[PDB]
Structures are given as structure tokens and as C-alpha cells.
């Protein structure tokens, strides 16, 4: 949780509202992963819970600040999924709702933070509606998500929505160059893969994900001339399958764009691979493979407990089957 500079302007607005007392009791922040919305929410909560703040900065020495640093403030309830799980249950939401009834122990404001609104189940989202609609006095909520359209309409309508705009591409590239040392094409490719969100590309570079991407690219380069896509299984069967499927979809889309003729592509560091992919496949086949890859990624991310190995094996077998002549390709439908 680092404070990126580009978050400074938006913060300056939000806190100002809370300085005038005309602050909404339910703020929903929309931002891509790695943008730093969590840092903004933490700063806002820290300012709210400070007993005697000056300007836009918490004092850092009052009881509230000391407890926040210790992380044992009686207020500041936090909702997050269990360590072993990946969803937020109704029990935690109901417990927080029950606890909110009583007065504030420190006599200040009560802050509730939801780690990620998209992880809430249907029951939890429905339960939180009444609490969000008419919260007690001096109660503040903070929700974070990357796609508000996924949330329930009833839940969305009860929150004031604030959107964070990613910075300019040139500024992000310069910041990444100052941070990490890599080729310009690699930086551009990482930034575009992260939907132009600096911080996510930095995280991608920090881990071994770049080596996995290179291995996947080499495997695809070997596989495309041969027509044996099954070999890609070893490069895709992993806990981070959605990211690799996203990379494959990006490669296919870049190949299709090159086939149609374009100047801007996502994969800037591998012109040879995209050119070879475009040469060896028809645009219709590329479209079909892209659609299947996206559908499989969505199914993998949505369904819980689904076995990834079987799904990926079936996907690869279907991809190999499509390339045969005289086969009905799929068509999107409602």
C-alpha cells in the first residue's frame, strides 16, 4: 500500500467535502487494480478518525492516530474475505451491522471499509442495503471496485460514485522508467496489458510473471506453425490462469488488428510473434479462438471450485479442432 503521486488531486477534493460537513455517507470508488484506491480510502479514514486534525493531514500523535498506527482502534470496522477463502460472507456483514447500533467508544466517527465490493455474495449485498440507506449518525462507508456494473442496482443506487482516471501514458511510462529498468517497448507492453494503470505493471515486473509471459510466448511461437496447441497446457495450468488467458487474448487481438491493418498494438515487444500468428491463421479463426478464450476465462473466474486442468484441456482440444477445414465456427448470440 504505497501512495502514488497521481492520487494527490482527487484526495484534495474528497477531504474538502468532509471539511464542510457535507460529505456523503457511502462513497464508492471505481479504479483499476494497482491504481491505489486503498491508499486513498486509508488516508480518508485516518483523517476522519483523527481527534484534532490540522489542514488535510492527521496530527499523528492523538489517541486515534496512535491506535490507528497500532491497528487496534475500537472503531474502524473492516470487512475482508477469510484468509483461506475469497468471498465475504453474510455473517461478517450482519455482525458489523449489529455492532454499529451502539455509540462510538471514542466519541468520534465510525468508519466501515469494504475491501472489495465485487466479492460480496448476494445475501451480504442484500443485507447491507438497509444499513447503507439510513446509517446512524457519524457513520461513514467506503467501497472499492473495478466494475460497478457487476454490483446490484439497488446497492449501486445508494452510493455516491467517484472515478479515478489513469494518468497520461507518457507520464506513466516516465514514472515506470524512474522506478524499474527495462526496455521502452517492454514498459509500453506492460502498461498496455494493465489497461494503462501504473503500479500494476510494476507489480508484474517485480514478480516472475514476466518469465512466465516469455515462456508462453515461446511456446505459442513453437506451437503455431505445428498446429498442436495442446502443448500450451503446460504453460497455462497454473493458479494465475486468468492472467495468462488474458495475455493470449491480447496476442490474438493484436494479430487480428495487424491483419486488418493498424498502427497501434498492445504487444509492442514481440512484432515477430504477432506477425507469424497473423500469417498462419485466418481472421475468422482468430476471432473464434479469441471468443472461446474470453468465455473460458470468464467461466474460470466466475464459477467456484471448477477444475482448471479439464477446462483448459477441453479449450485447447476445441482450438485444435476448429483449425480443421469444413468445421462450423461458433457465433456470438444472446
Amino acid at each position: 500500500m504505497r501512495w502514488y503521486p497521481w492520487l494527490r488531486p482527487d484526495f484534495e477534493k474528497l477531504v474538502a467535502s468532509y471539511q464542510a460537513g457535507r460529505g456523503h455517507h457511502a462513497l464508492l470508488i471505481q479504479a483499476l487494480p494497482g491504481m491505489g484506491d486503498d491508499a486513498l480510502i486509508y488516508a480518508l479514514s485516518r483523517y476522519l478518525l483523527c481527534q484534532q486534525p490540522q489542514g488535510h493531514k492527521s496530527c499523528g500523535h492523538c489517541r486515534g492516530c496512535q491506535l490507528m498506527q497500532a491497528g487496534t482502534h475500537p472503531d474502524y470496522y473492516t470487512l475482508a474475505p477469510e484468509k483461506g477463502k475469497n468471498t465475504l460472507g453474510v455473517d461478517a456483514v450482519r455482525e458489523v451491522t449489529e455492532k454499529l447500533n451502539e455509540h462510538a467508544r471514542l466519541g468520534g466517527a465510525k468508519v466501515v471499509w469494504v475491501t472489495d465490493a465485487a466479492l460480496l455474495t448476494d445475501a451480504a449485498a442484500n443485507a447491507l442495503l438497509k444499513t447503507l440507506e439510513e446509517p446512524p449518525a457519524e457513520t461513514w462507508f467506503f467501497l472499492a471496485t473495478r466494475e460497478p456494473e457487476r454490483l446490484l442496482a439497488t446497492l449501486r443506487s445508494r452510493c455516491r460514485l467517484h472515478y479515478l482516471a489513469p494518468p497520461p501514458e507518457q507520464y506513466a511510462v516516465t514514472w515506470l522508467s524512474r522506478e524499474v529498468t527495462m526496455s521502452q517497448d517492454a514498459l509500453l507492453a506492460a502498461l498496455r496489458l494493465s489497461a494503462g494503470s501504473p503500479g500494476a505493471a510494476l507489480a508484474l515486473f517485480q514478480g516472475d510473471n514476466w518469465q512466465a509471459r516469455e515462456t508462453l510466448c515461446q511456446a505459442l511461437a513453437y506451437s503455431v506453425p505445428s498446429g498442436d496447441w495442446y502443448s500450451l497446457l503446460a504453460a497455462l495450468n497454473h493458479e494465475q490462469a486468468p492472467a495468462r488467458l488474458h495475455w493470449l487474448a491480447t496476442l490474438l487481438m493484436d494479430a487480428l488488428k495487424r491483419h486488418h491493418g493498424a498502427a497501434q498494438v498492445t504487444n509492442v515487444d514481440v512484432p515477430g510473434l504477432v506477425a507469424e500468428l497473423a500469417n498462419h491463421l485466418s481472421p475468422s479463426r482468430l476471432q473464434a479462438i479469441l471468443g472461446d478464450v474470453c468465455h473460458i476465462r470468464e467461466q474460470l473466474m466466475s464459477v467456484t471450485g471448477i477444475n482448471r486442468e479439464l477446462l483448459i484441456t477441453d479449450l485447447l482440444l476445441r482450438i485444435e479442432h476448429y483449425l480443421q477445414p469444413g468445421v462450423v465456427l461458433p457465433v456470438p448470440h444472446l
Binding site: 501512495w3 502514488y4 494527490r8 485516518r46 442495503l129 438497509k130 487474448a249 488488428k257 491493418g261 479469441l290
Partner: protein, 367 residues
């Protein structure tokens, strides 16, 4: 203390509720004629005032003056209900009380006389969230309860409720508020609140409300917060990301002529400018619909599009109706699955590629 416009402007009388004329008329007639039922179920979309209607009905039932369709709003019972501390009004959040034990405890207290009011009102919010056993337990008492208890049900998913419950309730369907009604309410609220505004901003907010008044109020509050305390047309346009210019016309023309480079360059420029993709898709769908309707009859074109009329006419002369239908359907499908795509830009590009195939540091306190 300060309260948002959504909750502060909750209607307090039958004269402060916009629309829903049939429901209000039915309630008034029932109260006047004395034909009082013991099971009312308000169903409809969200942000239309089901809970407000239920609260007003409960207030009217338990008014000191008597059973009237126009609550005074000043007697002890009315103000007590407004403050939410009235004893005989039991507001049950069904979304957090789904267990059978709570319902059984509730139904064991129905035989006691009301404390101070003449009726014991149970207002169940979001009754669709209860379990099956809860519904079955309710059924018996709800069929024929005592004479001093009334049940009020509010929900937005009537399909969830079993047919058995629906067969023993008076159902009232709330319609979605029209754009004109929402605009009128918004301007009235802003005038009462002493906030500057312009007609275009109110029209845009009403159109974007999608028939929900709560959404309209939330958007108005967002604009006020980000509009430096003023509801300006420019501020609302910037917040909503309206296309304004004729970008959609250029994109649809490029798609129709099947020029991949042009459409890709336009999409790249739009992404650099940072526009909303949903608005772009809606604008393109509207343009396709207008082109088709004009192709039906030359005079169908509206007067607001004169500045771009001529170009559109050419499309209506060069594109068969079937191709227009195909493009509209493809754009609609792309809009439907836009959220599920890994990126919004990727979804838009995929939809356009599908369509192209158709052709003959100051850190405050954070680590």
C-alpha cells in the same frame, strides 16, 4: 446534522409523492370506504418509493384523528413514526432476519393488543430474501390474522415469493417515473434548496436516471459535490462523459464502409481522450435506429439532427435494412457483454472487429 438529499427529502404526505396515481387512489378509496385489507404487497423497480408508500400508509392507519387518507403529520403518532421510534410499528429487515426462529418469535407476539396505537403494523422490507420455512410459517397467520394487526410487504423481486403468499395479498405495482416527472421533482428540490441549475443539466440527469428517483438524487448530489456547489451543464456533461461531438457518426460511417485502419485510429484517439464506452455504444445504437427509421420514411428524421442530416441520408440510401439490423444487433450484443470483457476497450475493439466482418510526494498519512 447534515443529511443527503436522498433521505432528507423523503415524502411525508400523500401530496408529496410523484406519480403512482393509481396506487394512491386505490389506497384513498379503501381508507374512505372502510374496506381495509390485512396484506399489502408493493412491487416494482427500485428507487420508486415502496418503503415511503408503506410508511405513509402505516402513519395514516395509526393517526390520532382516525383512519384517514391524509395524515395530519403533527399529532404524536405521526411524528413518532417519522422519528422511527413508534412502538407499534415493527420494521423488519428481512434481508438480515431470514432465520425461522426470528419469524416464529415474531408470530408468537401477534396475539397481544397494541401498546398505544389502534393497529399493530408489521412492515417487512425486502421480503423476497426470507427462506422457504419463513414463508411457510408466515402463510398460516397471514391468511387470517387477528383484527388488530396489519401486514405490509415491500419487495423488488416478486418472482421469488411463492404463489401461495401472492394468492393472499393485495398487489400494487409501482411504475417507473417518467423523465418529465423526474426533471420536475429535481428542479423543485433544487429551488427549495437554493441551488443554481440549468435546464440542460436537469434534462441530462433525468435521462440518465433510467426511471429511478433515488438514482437521480444520487447523481444530483454527486454533481453538486464535484460541481463546486453548482449544477452546471458543463460539469454534468464532464461527469457523465457525454460524447457531444459527432464521434459516433464518424465511427459508424467507418464501420459501415469497412475501413479497419480508420476505425482503429478513431478508437485509439477516443481512448486517449478518455471517454465512456457505454455512452458511445448507446449513441451508435441510437444513430443506427434513426437511420433505419428514416429508411422507413424520409420524413422520419428529427429536426435536431439537421446539422448532420445530409450524411445520414446517404447511409439510408446506400445500406440495405438487413445490414442495419445486423449492425444494430451486433452492437447490442457487444453492449450486453461489455462488463464481462477483461477490459472495456478490449470489448469495444472486439465488437467492432466482429462488425467489420459484415461486408459483401506530499503523503498525508499512508504508508
Amino acid at each position: 446534522s447534515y443529511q443527503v438529499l436522498a433521505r432528507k427529502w423523503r415524502p411525508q404526505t400523500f401530496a408529496d409523492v410523484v406519480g403512482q396515481e393509481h396506487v394512491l387512489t386505490a389506497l384513498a378509496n379503501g381508507l374512505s370506504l372502510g374496506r381495509i385489507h390485512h396484506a399489502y404487497l408493493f412491487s416494482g423497480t427500485r428507487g420508486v418509493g415502496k418503503t415511503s408508500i408503506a410508511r405513509l400508509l402505516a402513519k395514516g392507519l395509526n393517526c390520532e384523528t382516525g383512519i384517514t387518507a391524509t395524515p395530519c403529520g403533527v399529532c404524536d403518532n405521526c411524528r413518532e413514526i417519522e422519528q422511527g421510534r413508534f412502538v407499534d410499528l415493527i420494521e423488519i429487515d428481512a434481508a438480515s432476519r431470514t432465520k425461522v426462529e426470528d419469524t416464529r418469535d415474531l408470530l408468537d407476539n401477534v396475539q397481544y393488543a397494541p401498546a398505544r396505537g389502534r393497529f399493530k403494523v408489521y412492515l417487512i422490507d425486502e421480503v423476497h430474501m426470507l427462506s422457504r420455512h419463513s414463508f411457510n410459517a408466515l402463510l398460516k397467520t397471514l391468511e387470517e390474522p387477528p383484527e388488530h394487526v396489519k401486514f405490509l410487504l415491500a419487495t423488488t423481486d416478486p418472482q421469488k415469493l411463492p404463489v401461495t403468499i401472492l394468492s393472499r395479498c393485495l398487489q400494487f405495482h409501482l411504475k417507473a417515473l417518467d423523465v418529465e416527472q423526474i426533471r420536475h421533482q429535481l428542479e423543485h428540490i433544487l429551488n427549495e434548496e437554493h441551488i443554481a441549475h440549468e435546464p440542460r443539466a436537469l434534462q441530462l440527469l433525468a435521462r440518465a436516471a433510467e426511471g429511478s428517483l433515488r438514482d437521480a438524487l444520487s447523481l444530483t448530489d454527486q454533481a453538486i459535490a464535484s460541481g463546486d456547489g453548482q449544477v452546471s451543464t458543463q460539469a454534468v456533461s464532464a461527469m457523465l462523459g457525454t460524447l457531444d461531438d459527432d464521434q459516433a457518426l464518424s465511427l459508424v460511417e467507418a464501420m459501415v464502409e469497412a475501413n479497419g485502419e480508420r476505425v482503429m485510429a478513431l478508437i485509439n484517439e477516443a481512448a486517449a481522450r478518455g471517454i465512456e464506452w457505454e455512452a458511445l455504444l448507446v449513441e451508435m445504437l441510437g444513430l443506427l435506429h434513426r437511420i433505419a427509421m428514416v429508411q422507413l420514411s424520409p420524413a422520419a428524421l428529427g429536426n435536431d439532427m439537421a446539422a448532420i442530416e445530409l450524411r445520414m441520408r446517404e447511409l439510408a440510401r446506400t445500406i440495405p435494412p438487413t445490414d442495419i439490423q445486423l449492425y444494430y444487433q451486433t452492437l447490442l450484443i457487444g453492449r450486453k457483454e461489455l462488463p464481462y470483457a477483461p477490459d472495456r476497450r478490449m470489448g469495444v475493439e472486439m465488437t467492432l472487429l466482429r462488425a467489420l466482418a459484415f461486408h459483401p510526494v506530499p503523503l498525508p498519512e499512508t504508508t
